[PDB]
């Protein structure tokens, strides 16, 4: 059926909430006696820290050299 709910955002998040989750992800520590019972549905690509600079350069070095010199 046609419905206006199909063309709306189902999940939204604010910049303050994203910054708080970034700080929490930075302050996360591992404890063997704590178990995960239910994951929280989060946009984890916006929360997790990015890849290392050497990896980011190395992963595009080959395509970069081919674009420079075919």
């Amino acid at each position: 059926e046609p419905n206006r709910k199909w063309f709306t955002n189902t999940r939204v998040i604010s910049q303050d909430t994203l910054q708080s989750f970034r700080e929490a992800m930075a302050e996360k520590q591992k404890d063997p006696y704590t178990v995960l019972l239910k994951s929280n549905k989060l946009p984890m690509s916006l929360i997790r820290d990015g890849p290392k600079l050497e990896d980011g350069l190395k992963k595009h070095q080959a395509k970069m050299t081919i674009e420079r010199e075919p």
């Binding site: 709910k5 199909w6 063309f7 709306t8 955002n9 189902t10 999940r11 939204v12 998040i13 604010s14 910049q15 994203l18 549905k41 946009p43 690509s45 916006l46």
Partner: protein, 65 residues
């Protein structure tokens, strides 16, 4: 894929999460760079499956905008 919203054939198929043609699914749109009018980040939207996954081996969907 975040969830399966509506399978057009059967609510049991929706509950089981069957991915068929015409299925409305919820997808994570963080990589698409979508913000709302209030500045909030939209990371969940609706897409419709436009192929046959059982015949194609992949799920192809179109965002409902």
């Amino acid at each position: 894929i975040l969830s399966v919203k509506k399978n057009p054939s059967n609510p049991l198929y929706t509950q089981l999460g069957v991915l068929t043609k015409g299925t409305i699914i919820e997808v994570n749109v963080s990589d698409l760079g979508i913000v709302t009018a209030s500045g909030k980040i939209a990371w969940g939207r609706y897409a419709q499956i436009t192929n046959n996954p059982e015949n194609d081996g992949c799920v192809n969907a179109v965002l409902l905008v």
